[PDB]
Amino acid sequence: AYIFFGPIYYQKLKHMVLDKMHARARGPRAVLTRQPTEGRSRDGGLRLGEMERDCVIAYGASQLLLER
Amino acid sequence: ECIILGQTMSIGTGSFKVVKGTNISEKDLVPKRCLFESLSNEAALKAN
């Protein structure tokens, strides 16, 4: 098939992966800490809300509730 | 109120129990006995 080719003005944004990879093992002051630029964008974080508590009830896994 | 207290829920997976069979018989569960009360009950009723 003939393939539509040509130049487009692209642009690179913010929001790279190097300051969004965030992990935590145990205890406060998590070991993989992202850069502190949130700006009214608290999307939960490393939590387990009540919307996610309701999903594992439907599976019926009772020993994952006590573990998590 | 089992996720607040930390108990296991009564539905889903914790709706039963698994218990382990001991695989034991009634031959090992015998009251072993040799000359314990074979005469100590006998020498207490003679004319008294």
Side-chain angles (χ1 to χ4, degrees), chain B residues 13-35:
Chain B
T13 308
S15 66
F16 65 94
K17 290 183 183 293
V18 288
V19 303
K20 186 178 184 293
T22 61
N23 290 318
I24 204 65
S25 296
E26 66 182 2
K27 283 91 171 65
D28 291 330
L29 275 72
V30 292
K32 62 183 288 184
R33 185 179 177 182
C34 53
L35 279 76

Side-chain angles (χ1 to χ4, degrees), chain A residues 9-27:
Chain A
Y9 185 80
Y10 279 159
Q11 59 188 359
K12 188 177 180 181
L13 279 76
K14 298 191 296 186
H15 302 287
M16 296 179 71
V17 74
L18 194 146
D19 54 356
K20 285 181 176 291
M21 179 178 70
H22 183 72
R24 182 177 180 271
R26 185 182 293 117

Side-chain angles (χ1 to χ4, degrees), chain A residues 23 44 48 65:
Chain A
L48 198 282
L65 287 170

